[PDB]
């Protein structure tokens, strides 16, 4: 269930607004449907008034104002442990080689 709405977009910086009681903590992750691929935002600052300022871990082109935003309750989490050996990943811990999903046990 998504609860926030994008309020501004300025280059890679995105501001989203949340209900006054559910503001994401700093460094929490968010996500939005940028076109038809999800986009993950990392929270940097809590501005006043329930607005929160974030940086897009991806291209922000295509983001409308008013899109819905979903609050994940945790920081960026990545697969860890032995399963990762010999794989290639991005920041989000998605596989970037073609060999399919990482058999992660823990994040």
């Amino acid at each position: 269930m998504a609860t926030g709405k994008i309020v501004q977009v300025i280059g890679a910086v995105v501001d989203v607004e949340f209900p006054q009681d559910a503001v994401p903590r700093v460094y929490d992750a968010l996500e939005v449907q940028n076109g038809n691929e999800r986009l993950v935002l990392e929270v940097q600052q809590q501005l006043g008034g329930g607005i929160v300022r974030t940086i897009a871990m991806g291209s922000s082109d295509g983001l409308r104002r008013g899109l819905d935003v979903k609050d994940l309750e945790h920081p960026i989490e990545v697969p860890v442990g032995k399963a990762t050996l010999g794989r290639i990943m991005n920041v989000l811990g998605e596989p970037v080689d073609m060999k399919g999903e990482i058999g992660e046990e823990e994040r």
Binding site: D21, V23, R25, Q45, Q46, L47
Partner: protein, 85 residues
């Protein structure tokens, strides 16, 4: 009509009726968090240089007694503070 105090007493009546109330003194709410700095609303009795006690066992130092807020620096990890604490 003129309501010289009629509006005045009326507004007090209606504010009490809708249960708007001030903070206490000693008491405030975090308004903003960023990069280790805090902005607090309330604390009408905070004094410059004072130790403000956050949730958790940690403190902030009051640097500015702004007209409408207090500026403070968190002595510790600021990551887990949230507006409305």
């Amino acid at each position: 009509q003129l309501n010289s105090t009629e509006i005045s007493e009326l507004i007090k009546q209606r504010i009490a009726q809708f249960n708007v109330v001030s903070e206490a003194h000693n008491e405030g709410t975090i308004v903003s968090v960023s990069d280790g700095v805090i902005r607090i609303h309330g604390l009408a009795d905070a004094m410059q240089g004072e130790m403000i006690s956050l949730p958790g066992n940690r403190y902030a130092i009051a640097l500015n007694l702004e007209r409408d807020s207090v500026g403070a620096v968190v002595m510790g990890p600021y990551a887990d503070l949230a507006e409305g604490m």
